[PDB]
Each structure stands twice: as C-alpha cells, then as structure tokens.
Amino acid sequence: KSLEEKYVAVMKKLQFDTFEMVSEDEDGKLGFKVNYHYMSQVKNANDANSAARARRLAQEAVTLSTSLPLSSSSSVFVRCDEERLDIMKVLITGPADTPYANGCFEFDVYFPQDYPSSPPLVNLETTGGHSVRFNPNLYNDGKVCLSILNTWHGRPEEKWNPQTSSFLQVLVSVQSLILVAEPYFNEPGYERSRGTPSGTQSSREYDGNIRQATVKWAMLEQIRNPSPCFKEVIHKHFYLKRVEIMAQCEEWIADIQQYSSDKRVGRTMSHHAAALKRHTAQLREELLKLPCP
Amino acid sequence: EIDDALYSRQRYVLGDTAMQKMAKSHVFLSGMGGLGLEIAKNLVLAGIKAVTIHDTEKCQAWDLGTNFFLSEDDVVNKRNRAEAVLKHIAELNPYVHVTSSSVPFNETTDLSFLDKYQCVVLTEMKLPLQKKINDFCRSQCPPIKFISADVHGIWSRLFCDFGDEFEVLDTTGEEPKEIFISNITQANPGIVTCLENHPHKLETGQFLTFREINGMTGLNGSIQQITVISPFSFSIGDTTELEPYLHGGIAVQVKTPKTVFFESLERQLKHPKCLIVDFSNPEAPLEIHTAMLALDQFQEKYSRKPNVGCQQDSEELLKLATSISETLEEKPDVNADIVHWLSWTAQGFLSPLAAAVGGVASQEVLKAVTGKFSPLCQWLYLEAADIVESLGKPECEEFLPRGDRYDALRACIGDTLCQKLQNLNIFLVGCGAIGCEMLKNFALLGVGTSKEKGMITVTDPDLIEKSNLNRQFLFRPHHIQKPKSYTAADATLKINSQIKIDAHLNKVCPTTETIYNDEFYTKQDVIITALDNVEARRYVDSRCLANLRPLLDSGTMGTKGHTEVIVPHLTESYNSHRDPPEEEIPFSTLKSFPAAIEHTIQWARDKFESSFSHKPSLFNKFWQTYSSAEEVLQKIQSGHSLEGCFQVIKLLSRRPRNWSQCVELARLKFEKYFNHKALQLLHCFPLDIRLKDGSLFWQSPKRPPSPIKFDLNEPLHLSFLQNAAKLYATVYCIPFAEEDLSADALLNILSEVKIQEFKPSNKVVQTDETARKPDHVPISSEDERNAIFQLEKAILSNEATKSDLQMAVLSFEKDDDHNGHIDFITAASNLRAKMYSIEPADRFKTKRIAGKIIPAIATTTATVSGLVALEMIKVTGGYPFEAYKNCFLNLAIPIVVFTETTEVRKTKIRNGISFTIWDRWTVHGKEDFTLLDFINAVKEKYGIEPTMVVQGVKMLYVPVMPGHAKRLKLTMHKLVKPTTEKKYVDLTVSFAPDIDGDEDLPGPPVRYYFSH
Ligand SMILES: O=P(O)(O)O[C@H]1[C@H](OP(=O)(O)O)[C@@H](OP(=O)(O)O)[C@H](OP(=O)(O)O)[C@@H](OP(=O)(O)O)[C@H]1OP(=O)(O)O
Ligand SMILES: Nc1ncnc2c1ncn2[C@@H]1O[C@H](COP(=O)(O)OP(=O)(O)OP(=O)(O)O)[C@@H](O)[C@H]1O
Helix, strand or coil: CHHHHHHHHHHHHHHEEECCCEECCCCCCCEECCCCCCHHHHHHCCCCCCHHHHHHHHHHHHHHHHHCCCCCCCEEEEEECCCECCCEEEEEECCCCCCCCCCEEEEEEECCCCCCCCCCEEEECCCCCCCCCCECCECCCCEECCCCCCCCCCCCCCCCCCCCCCHHHHHHHHHHHHCCCCCHHHCCCCCCCCCCHHHHHHHHHHHHHHHHHHHHHHHHHHHHCCCCCCHHHHHHHHHHCHHHHHHHHHHHHHHHHHHCCCCCHHHHHHHHHHHHHHHHHHHHHHHHHCCCC | CCCHHHHHHHHHHHCHHHHHHHCCCEEEEECCCHHHHHHHHHHHHHCCCEEEEECCCECCCHHHHHCCCCCHHHHHHCCEHHHHHHHHHCCCCCCCEEEEECCCCCCCCCCHHHHHCCEEEEECCCHHHHHHHHHHHHCCCCCCEEEEEEEEECEEEEEEECCCCEEECCCCCCCCCEEEEEEECCCCCCEEEECCCCCCCCCCCCEEEEEEEECCHHHCCCEEECEEEECCEEECCCCCCCCCCCEEEEEEECCCCEEECCCCHHHHHCCCCECCCCCCCCHHHHHHHHHHHHHHHHHHHHCCCCCCCCHHHHHHHHHHHHHHHHHCCCCCCCCHHHHHHHHHCCCCECHHHHHHHHHHHHHHHHHHHHCCCCCCCCEEEEECHHHHHCCCCCCHHHCCCCCCCCHHHHHHHCHHHHHHHHCCEEEEECCCHHHHHHHHHHHHHCCCCCCCCCEEEEECCCECCCHHHHCCCCCCHHHCCCEHHHHHHHHHHHHCCCCCEEEECCCCCHHHCCCCCHHHHHHCCEEEECCCCHHHHHHHHHHHHHHCCCEEEEEEECCEEEEEEECCCCECCHHHCCCCCCCCCCHHHHHCCCCCHHHHHHHHHHHHHHHHHHHHHHHHHHHHHCCCHHHHHHHHHCCCCCCCHHHHHHHHHCCCCCHHHHHHHHHHHHHHHHHHHHHHHHHHCCCCCECCCCCECCCCCCCCCCCCCCCCCCHHHHHHHHHHHHHHHHHCCCCCCHHHHCHHHHHHHHHHCCCCCCCCCCCCCCCCCCCCCCCCCCCCHHHHHHHHHHHHHHHHCCCCCHHHHCCCCCCCCCCCCCCCHHHHHHHHHHHHHHHCCCCCCCHHHHHHHHCCCCCCCHHHHHHHHHHHHHHHHHHHHCCCCCCCEEEEEECCCCEEEEEECCECCCEEEECCEEECCCCCEEEECCCCCEHHHHHHHHHHHHCCCEEEEEECCEEEECCCCCCCHHHHHCEHHHHCCCCCCCCEEEEEEEECCCCCCCCCEECCCEEEECCC
16 A cells, blocks of 8 residues: 555656757757657747746756656656757646556647747657557547647637646646547536437447557556656556556456447457557566566 | 729728718818927828818928928018919829818808818917808718827817717727627526626727627527626626527627717807826916916917016916906916917917827828717817926027027927937838828928938838838928838938938848947937837837837837837837737638638648649759659669658649649649538538537537538639639749639539549547647658559659649738738638638628738828827927827827836835836956956845846856866866857856745856957
8 A cells, every 4th residue: 555655656756757868969950869749849940949838848847857746656757958948848648447447648848939829839759650649539549639738629718828827737638638538528418428328339449549659658658668768667657557457457358258249349349358468468568577777 | 983902901901981081182281380280191091072271371491491391492482382382292192182272261251161071170370260150060961080280399279079969970990899708698688607707898889780609599699788797798688588599699889879068169269178198287278278278368369479588478367367267167377387488379370280190180180071989079189298398597698599490499499409409310110101291291391401410210121012102201202112211311301401310221130230230329329110010110119228228119000109218328129028929820710610711711822832832942942852753763762751742743743734634633622621621621520519518519609610622613613613713823833814813714624524423531630719829730652552553644744844843832912802811811812711700801801801901091190109209309309208108099099198118117126225227237357357257246236136147048056066166266268168259259148135945046147358
C-alpha cells in the first residue's frame, strides 16, 4: 500500500526538469537532438520576442515546478529545452478504470510569439505511427481538441483567455476530459447513445481497441523505443507499476473476453484480445527483464 | 465621361453625381499669394471643369519665397503672377479649362461679369469690397457661393457664406447602415429590437425604411422616423395597429437632404459663428476674430501692416481691438499677447499653415458646388502661436528681412530657427502624395539646405502610376513607371536649387536594416512616416524608439485624417497604441452562409485567387519537385503518399486543348458554383428545416439561396463566361482571338456543350458560425484509383510534355481593364448575391472593396500635412511637452480637434524607482566578467536586484532551474555565445515584486558591452 506514497515521493523529483532540444553551431544553424513535431516552425518563428511571453513562461514554469499533478493514476511530467522556452514536451499517465489505464502519452507543445494572447499549440506524438484515433478529441495525427485550446466546440468562457488561463489548467483539462473511462461517449451523439445496449456495445468495441492500442504504443513502444527526454522516467514508472500492469492486463484480457461473447462485435473484440495477449506476453518479458533503474 | 483610371480614388470619396456637377462648374479665384496658388492647385487636381485665375500684382523677389512655380526671371520681367503661374498649372490637368484675368478690383468695379461662376474665392482683399461682393453674390439667383480667406504671419482666417439657404444633399460620406431585426413589439410607439450582439449605431431623429419583414408584412417598404431607446433598441412610431410580428426584417438607413442657413459677411462680423478646434480654449477663436478685425481696421486706416517690434503699432492695434471688442455682443477680454504677436508677425507669411487652410478652403469650395458634405458655418481660425509662445520675448533682429528667398519665413520664426531648419537632417520613409507635398514644403522652408549638415533622405520602392497622378501632383503622364523617389527629387530641385537631397529605391523593412543601420539613424534628427499600413509603422516606431529619435505620422481616410506626434523622453510611441484587430468573416459565413454583398465579393476574390494564382502555382511546384508522370506512377504504385498528386491529376485530366473545351470548362464551373453547390446545400437544409428549438433555420442572418439556370442571353452570364474562358485559356496557354468571344461563337460552342446532372451528397455542412478553416478529407480509395487511371490515360494521350506539366500563374491585377479580373469577380459576386436574394453591386464598388482601395483626396493630404510640417518646426525647436498637439479632423462635418499628445507613462518598478520606453540600461564588461558580476553590477548601478535574464528568445538564467546557479559563475564571453556583429548584446531582466508569487516586474531593456 506504501507503493503509492513511494511513487509520489520518488518521481516528484522527476515531474519537473529540463532536457536539451536545440542543437546549433556558433552560427545559429538550427538542428534538433530528438524527435519533435514543430521543427520548421522553431526556425521560422520571429525573433522579436515579447518580454510578456518570456515572463509568462517563467512564471508558469515556477507554478508547474511547485504544483504539478502527481498520482500513480494520473500524473503530469514537464520537460523543456534547457536553453529555449517555447518548445515544450509533456508526459501524461492515464488514470485507472480508463482504457488508457496506467499508460503514458508524450506531447509536443509550442508557444507562439503573441502568447499569452493565443493558446499554445499541442499535439500528441504517442499515436504510434499517427494512425490511432485515441479520442474523439485526439485524432490519428495526434491533434488535441479542447475548448481552452480553441480546438473543440464550446463557449467562449470555456475557451482561451490570455489573462486567466494557465497551462496547468490546460494539463488538468487534458487529464480530466481526454484520459477518461468513457472516451467513446466523448464524441457528440454518442453520449446520446448511452443508456442503450447498442451504445454500450460500441463503447465496448472502442474501449477494447483503445486498450490494445495503449498496450501496444503507450507501454510497449514507450519502453522499447523511449524518447530520450523521458527515457529514464518512463522506465522507473513502469518498474514501479509492473505488478499493477500485470494485474490490469490480466483484468483487461478477462474483460475483453466478456465482450468477445458477442457474435460480430465480439469478433473484433477477439482480434483486440489476440493483440492484447501478444503485447501482454511482450510486456511480461519486459517486466521480467526490467530491474530497478 | 469620368476617367476612372485617373479618378477612381476620388470617385470612391465623392460619388459620380458630384463629379457630374463639377463637369459643369465654373470657379473664379482672385489673389495669387501662396494661399491662392495652393487653392488653385487643389481645385485643378480635383477636376473643376473651368477655373478662372486672377491677380493684379507683379512678381516680387519676396514672392519667390512663397511660390513653387515662379522664377527669378519672372521677377526680372516683372510679370503679373497670375499668367506667370498659368503656364505651370496647365500641366496639372488637361481636362480642366484654365483661364486667367487681371481686371483691377475696386469700389467702382462692376461685378456682373462674375455671374458665370458658381463659387468665387478672394484672398488678400480689403474688407469693404468683400462686403460689397458678398452683397452682390447673395442677391443673385442662384446665389454665388462666397468664400474669403487670408493669411498673416502665424495667423489665418477662413470664412464662407452660401446665401440665405444652402442645400445639402448628403450629410455624411458613410454608407447607409443596415441592421438585422431580432424582434419588434406591437406598441405605441413600437419597440424595435435588433440582433443585440451588435449595437444600434444610430441616433434619434434619423430616417429609416424596412424590408424583408415577416409577420408584420405591412412594414415591407414602410418608411418611419426613429427615436433611440437603448444601445440595442429604438422606436419608429405606432405599431399597435399592425399585425403580430413573426420573424425576419432589416432596418435600412435612409439618407435625407438638409438645408443650412448662412448670414451676410458684414452681419457675421458681429455674433460670429465660430467652429472650435480646441475645446479647452473655445474662447480663443473669438479673440482671433477680434484681433483679425482690428488688424483689418489698422490696414484700412494706415494702408500698411504693423512693423515688427514697433511698440506704437502694437499699442494702436491693442487700442483698436479693445474698441472693437466693446462693439461686440460678448465683449470678451482682448488677449494682449495675441495682439502683440500679431503685430510682431504681421508682415510674415508662414507657408505650411497657408497650405493647410488652403486645403480646408478647397474642400469648402468642393462642398459649395456639390452639397456632398455639411459645410462650415461660418468662421474658422487656425493658429501657430504655440511656436512663438515658446520663444518668450525675442527681438526684431531675428525677424528683420535680409534679401533672401526666406525673408517671409524669417519674419515669422526668426533667423536662428531658420538656421536650425537649414541644418536639419530629415529621413522620410514612403513617397506617397504626403511625401511629395512634404518635400515641397521643405523646399519652401529651406530645410536641409546648409552646406555643412542639412540633408534630406527619402526612399520608396514603388513606381509612378496613372492613378497616383491624381493626388501625387509632382508627376506627369510621361513620368509613368519611373521611380517615385527619383522623380519626386528631380521635381523638387526646380522648386529650390539649394536643397541637399538623397533618394533611394528601397523598401524599409528588417531585410534592408543593414543600409538603414543605427549609425544611419544617429545621423538623422527627425523621421517622418507617410506609410499606408500598420506593420511598417510598427517597425519604424520600434527602430526610432531604439535609436531615441522623434517621430511624426499621419493617416488619411477620405475627409477624415489625423496626426501623431512622438518626442523622446516626453510622449508615448506608436507601438503604444493597441487598436483592436480587424473583423474576420467566419469560414462558414464566407463558404456557405453569406448575408451581405461583401461576403460574396470576398468569396469571389478568394475563388479567383485559388483558381488562377494558387492552384497553378501548386501545379508548377509539384511538377518541379517531381519530373516524370511515369515516375510518379511508380511512386504511387509502391505506396508513396504524394501530396496533392490526386488533385494535380484531376486538373491535368481536365486540361482543355482548344477554345471550345475552355469555354465548356468555364460553363461546367458555372454549373458547379451556381446550381450544384446550391442544390447540395438545399438538400442538406430544405427551406422548412428547423433548429433544435423548432425555430427557422433559414432566417436572419441565414439567407436561403436559390439555384440559377444558365442563359447566354443574360449579360451577366455572357460576361462571366467570357472572362472565365479568357482566364482559363491564359492559364492553360490555349491561344484564341477576340472573335472567339463573340456571342455567336459562344452559342455555337454551347450547342455542342452538354451539362452533367446534379447529384446529392452527404458532405458535412460546417454550419458552425465560429468555425475555422478545417483540414482536408484524407485520400479515399476512389481518389488514388481515379488518379492512376487518369495519369495512365494521359500517358496514352501523350499529354506528358513539360508544356502539359506546367501552366501560367496569373497575378491579381486590379486597375487595368484588359486583364478582366475585375469583370470576372464582379460577375461572380453578382451571381452569388442573386442566389441569396442579395442586391448586386456595381463594378466600381466591387473594385473598391476587392482591391481594398483607400478612398483618398489630395486636399485632406495637404490639410493634415500642413499641420505635420508645423509640428516638425516645434520638434526642431525642442519645445516642451505642452507645445506638441496631436490632432484629428473630419472635413465631412467639418471638424478639427487639437489635443495634447499622450504623455509618457512612468513605469514604476520598485521602491519608487521607475523607467520609461525612452530608456535602455547599459553595462560595460570584460572577458572574465561573469553573470554574477552582471547581476551585482545591475544591482549597484540601478538599486534593484535582478531575478532572471533572457537573451531575446533564449533563457540565460532562471533561479528555479536545476543547477543554474553555476551559470552565474560562467563568463559572458562564453555563456552569451556572442557574435562578432556587435561590441554588446541586448537582453531582458525582471525584478522581484513586493508580494510573493507575483510575476517578476519587467524592467527596461539591458545592453551588456563586452569591452569597456
Ligand atoms: O479548392 P478550392 O478552389 O478552395 O475550391 C474547391 C474546389 O472547387 P473548384 O472545382 O471550383 O475549384 C473543389 O473541386 P476540385 O478542386 O477538387 O476539382 C471542390 O470539391 P468537389 O470537387 O468535391 O466539389 C470544393 O468543394 P467542397 O469543399 O464543397 O468539396 C471547393 O471548395 P469551395 O466550396 O471552398 O470552393
Ligand atoms: N515599408 C515601406 N518602405 C517604403 N515605402 C513604403 C513602405 N510601405 C509602403 N511604402 C510606400 O507607401 C506608399 C503609399 O502611397 P499612397 O498612400 O499614396 O498610395 P499608393 O501605394 O501610391 O497607391 P494606392 O492608391 O494604389 O494604394 C507607396 O508608394 C509605397 O511605396
């Protein structure tokens, strides 16, 4: 039971830090040491930097370093270039009971010149070849749809505010709205399909697909091909979570087989179950191999 | 007929009726000092049909300093000024019949010859004959519009009198507003409620008509007067007798004529109707009136102006003013200082004020012959007393004449100030009409003529065009396509041979900053901006703020205009202004739900650009990245997800090869735009479709469209197809002749043409009224298989040569007629408007809106620019903050408002310390100098502790970063990663606030030098 407390204590040192992104010669020729979404826009940005932008970024960095969300269910990881500011990257752990349970999701975030006038650009890179539409708000390419980002439907009050809105609120909204136990119903018209066996059955299909995709990319590909930015952190996280990973994957195998009882959607559930079992065997090999980092 | 290519910008200001009135206009002007010449130039540029110029005096050497056409030869020959300047002014406008006259004017002179003219202007005239002429003109039927104006030193007078009644046809140049009605109640008076997102924007007593009202169908075509109830509601009279309201309805503004009454000149001397230009001193214009009348009395009594420094003359003028004020109704206290300064500067002539008042008088003349705008009623006075007020009590030797071409200005401002002006180094950016007339004013002022320092720098990348000839008066038709700056410079040497001027053909922007570096900025003294856009203004303002130099700016919009003054250590900057971002038409509104003419115009413009500029460029870029059709086929066979290859193949498979195929392509595009898309949208949303609440979907602002059947006999369809076929043949490089555009040939082609039928589809309509531009739908299997089949069939047809693989890209030409872009866009916009039951727009209005053409007139330019030059003198004099006056004007009212410029705001930082935009802290350093040393040096030098440092976009040190205390120990010459470009680097610092957790308070920019 002390696992949760040790989890909080250890990786709080690992929530907030900086890692080096930009590589240049003394002539300013821009290159990058890792994979990032907005390579071109870093070089194509205007260098008349507004002091308000930098001060807001510094204050937000202080606020994150002091108050990052942290729980083995849901957590937020902050890394930024050690030298530049607007380039940004996040890592998010999926809460329990969700098809994203205990997976991790790396993000690429950019800040425009006019910031805080406009919300920062956000995009998920854990989509795995950019083919998995993990959420109605998260398409295959990884586009992030939220009202606060002005990328999702909603009222202007729910949308961006240059003065009141903060990136920590954006991260909290991501955790509370995207990584949910009912992502199928997130799309408009599917919350209306709730209360019917057809809607619940389609939710079963979607959530099983999301489960197997998370096991494939967010765990297996995140440990076998980790980004160097969060490479050590993700390994420590999965080492501490290895037991619950086995319990969760066994529970998912049992539950996805319950959905497999259906004749046709249960066939898709059987395909997802086969993929889940394959990735579970692979992750079990990894957990057996993985020592304390 | 109106020369559109010459007059379009002025047309957008005045309207064709105004020019048609001026096609019959005859105007007489007498008195050819600087003021008369400026007024004549303005009127000739405007395009008055016939102008009769007049003077009875001969050219003095003194007159050379007040004229930009006369020469020393004219003075030598003692030629009369009128016919002397007649030669040059004839070049300004061939369409204007310019004549001359020299009949002496006196009490016995018969005035019957003036009957042919509609407006008569007098300058330098004695008051009793002004009164007699005013009596004569007002007794005529129709009365002759009377205007008198004079300039004496730093003072000016303007008066107008249009008879007992003057008709005004238009009270404002703005378009009649249209407001969408949300609800109207049945009451006495009925309460009209607009769509309350947008304000009422109207006033009580205004006049409206209504259309497309449902429920109260009796209000269709109803005509009511209004009374404002709220910023979102108003009443139009009884509606209780009407039927209940259901939906719809648009309130349309109705323009109503008016009549303004003018009094006789003599009776207007008492109880004068004065227009206030400074609401803080409304008493001043009456004092100016009294002082001017006293000066007139002195001139009448002694037949001469008061001499500078003549105490007896000043005392007599003060006595006369005191006596006259006692005969006035109000009897205000006579401003002895104003009288003293008038006596001091009586004999002088200050040219910029003369130009400004001349422009104002020219606009008053324009009003007098058209009724297009509400005129002045009746007196106007302008002052330059601020300049002399800062001089305290100088002595006459500064202002005494010395025999040069600047004695008139010397009598106004003093010799030392003239020397300061001659030593000025002035950098002017942009060479619009403002630039040309400013250079003319500088030539008149002798600015930048001294051998040692005085230099004028100008630059502009644009070339001269016919449309610019209307207001950029320096240029001529044979100067077309020549550089603006070079020709403008060449013309100015004629005005003044002593000028020292350099010209450049360079756009001013960060890429050209190397030429205009900070060393160039240091060599300058004042910077003048004549730009037409905001971003260049921002860039110039930032540069001059970084270089600590004064800046002046002016904007012109029709009759409206304004002036901006920026002085180091005294005022704000242009980059202080945060005017809101402009309107954005929603993507859904433009693509699917246009409610206004401008929406269809914008849609047509965007479609034209996409069809003929964007897509051909994309095709050429694709066939430059990829070289062989078989190569692309091999790529896509191996699963290459090439970008836009599907659309490229779709375009190539639709490439016409003869004129008939081009015409049929145009016809099918017509069908797609105007029947298929409308049918698809109506399939998604029938007329009776309703919202979730059951309310109407096709209700305000959603206007329901209607598909249109093609007919070649329709002129709109004929023009649209002709222009579309011409443009497509240009892009596809298919040659053709003008005979192919004949309706007979089009009919013959159309008889062969067959039209594909419409089909409904489930393409999702983006009804979201705040929707942004979406992304593309991914490539379906149909797309790639059709692409493969079509590229294979193109290879079979051998349509794979470089001519097939590249096309012509057409630019957006907006002024020429032969390109036909204007015709095509107007036709498309009219068709789309007709679809949504929206009134079609004419060619000229479409050209105005689509080209974003600013309606402009040279008179407003000269008016604002006289004030700009005046403020340039004050900037040269180094006067305190009080002297500088920001100003705004709207000649349509007319109205002028002087106001103090915005004071610089002291940015309090901590413990009573403060900084300003006119501040940039510096620190000299060394090779071993560290970041801790830098922080300690800043703390010691400015008494405040730094918290965090940033190099541009790049973080240098932040306390809450891991191990960044080591960065403090690191040396500048290594951590900064300096370039060899500078001896220094620029950076930003913030400082600790008093309250913990507050964002660190930003300070001024800080520059660290690498050496001492
Ligand atoms: O690409 P754009 O110039 O912005 O306009 C396109 C274009 O219409 P045009 O045929 O008039 O150029 C498309 O046609 P193609 O380029 O693919 O031939 C058409 O697509 P469809 O062929 O599927 O009709 C589409 O219409 P839509 O967005 O309704 O699919 C329409 O877009 P606009 O409505 O903005 O003109
Ligand atoms: N950054 C810049 N540097 C130099 N000149 C500039 C810059 N931006 C604009 N200009 C100049 O501003 C001038 C604007 O002049 P003006 O307002 O009289 O209209 P125009 O551009 O000549 O014509 P139009 O009536 O078609 O707009 C142009 O001649 C252009 O060369």
